[PDB]
């Protein structure tokens, strides 16, 4: 039976599935750090589920089949064009930032839903609470205007206030010159155009605003480049923590019921992302909207409900 008020009425509660090993874990690191392998190893050792970083086409992997859709139908933005031409006049920068924030919001909703419905913990690679560092980096470098950051702040204020912050935040600290060296050695032709001021603004943002704010609600475990390879040490550090300060031990069954009813129903999660604020970067005209929607509706498995598409081989339609 799908979870709802009736499932809550008889039987199913949430606190009887938490086994002290929920521990929503977030790893934050400067561009091109070892946070990915660290998160994977932490998830493997602790037995939690790993959530790879939310990309442009994250929502594509959660619906239909995991195959990503065309950039015109999903995202309408690219990271390569932002690296190559950050000051473009088509508004690609803030469009990309807002789409990535929405994808991170959806991923956080999915992680919370999994944790509440199953009890096994999750290990995210970057949360909605640490997404504003890139926003400040673009704003300080002049990549975006001020109205864009105001719209971002409004959306964040109306969206991120419904969820719970992660139990523990893990930060990987790497100096800017090391980041530049790793970027140069990596090989992708677009990422060597990342200026040093951008990465410096990102890190200034992380230390000054994110970690000081998270230290009031969670536990912060800062590390370094040389101690981010022995994942057994960081796992031992995590499993010897005092989780008594955040709002997580202050949650009753009714609060968990409301949160579980909210994390599912992804439309309710994404409701406030499309507020009627008309910024030139994100506003899309009626004609282009109609054309793109008609194009999306013609996809092989997107015309009807996920069970009523005879195109992708669904049968027994006339009796469902």
């Amino acid at each position: 039976l799908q979870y709802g008020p009736l499932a809550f009425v008889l039987g199913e509660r949430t606190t009887r599935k938490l086994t002290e090993t929920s521990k929503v874990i977030t790893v934050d690191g400067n561009i091109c750090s070892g946070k990915g392998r660290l998160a994977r190893e932490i998830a493997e050792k602790l037995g939690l589920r790993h959530f790879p970083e939310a990309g442009i086409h994250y929502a594509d992997s959660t619906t239909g089949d995991g195959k990503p859709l065309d950039v015109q139908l999903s995202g309408n933005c690219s990271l390569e064009k932002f690296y190559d031409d950050p000051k473009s006049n088509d508004g690609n920068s803030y469009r990309l930032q807002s789409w990535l924030y929405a994808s991170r919001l959806l991923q956080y909703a999915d992680a919370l839903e999994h944790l509440l419905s199953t009890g096994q913990g999750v290990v995210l690679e970057r949360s909605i609470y640490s997404d504003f560092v890139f926003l400040e980096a673009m704003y300080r470098q002049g990549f975006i205007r001020k109205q864009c950051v105001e719209h971002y702040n409004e959306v964040k204020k109306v969206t991120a206030c419904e969820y719970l912050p992660p139990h523990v935040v893990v930060y990987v600290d790497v100096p800017v010159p090391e980041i530049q060296s790793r970027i140069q050695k990596k090989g992708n032709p677009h990422e060597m155009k990342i200026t040093a001021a951008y990465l410096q603004d990102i890190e200034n943002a992380y230390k000054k605003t994110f970690l000081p704010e998270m230290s009031e609600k969670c536990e912060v475990l800062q590390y370094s480049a040389r101690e981010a390879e022995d994942a057994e040490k960081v796992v031992e550090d995590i499993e010897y923590l005092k989780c008594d300060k955040g709002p997580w031990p202050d949650q009753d069954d009714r609060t968990f019921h409301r949160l579980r009813m909210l994390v599912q129903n992804k439309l309710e999660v994404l409701n406030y992302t499309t507020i009627p604020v008309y910024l030139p970067e994100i506003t899309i005209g009626a004609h282009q909207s109609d054309r793109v929607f008609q194009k999306f509706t013609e996809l092989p498995g997107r015309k009807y409900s996920p069970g009523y598409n005879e195109d992708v081989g669904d049968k027994w339609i006339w009796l469902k």
């Binding site: 006049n89 088509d90 008309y278 899309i284 005209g285 004609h287």
Partner: protein, 104 residues
């Protein structure tokens, strides 16, 4: 962005004669266009117009006008021969009408 919308450019007119020199101006696909022309012509000019006009031209005289003419001929013949007036002013018999008794 010094603009206000992410708007598609306005498309230019699509000429039906470019990819179809004999278009008939009904559709883009030549076969369905030709058949649309054929059905329009056959059911407008051939069936409805000519057959409908010849059906209307030959409707039976339900308006009772040849009948009215024959009635008039017989009544004129009978009335004139007898010396009676061709037409009578009072449409109804005065005997069957009861006027008010007095007007004072």
């Amino acid at each position: 962005p010094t603009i206000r919308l992410q708007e598609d450019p306005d498309p230019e007119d699509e000429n039906l004669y470019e990819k179809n020199p004999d278009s008939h101006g009904y559709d883009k696909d030549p076969i369905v266009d030709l058949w649309n022309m054929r059905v329009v012509f056959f059911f407008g000019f051939s069936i409805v117009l000519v057959l409908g006009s010849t059906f209307v031209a030959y409707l039976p005289d339900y308006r009772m006008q040849e009948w009215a003419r024959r009635e008039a001929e017989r009544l004129v013949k009978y009335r004139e021969a007898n010396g009676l007036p061709l037409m009578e002013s009072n449409c109804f018999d005065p005997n069957k009408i009861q006027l008010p008794e007095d007007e004072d």
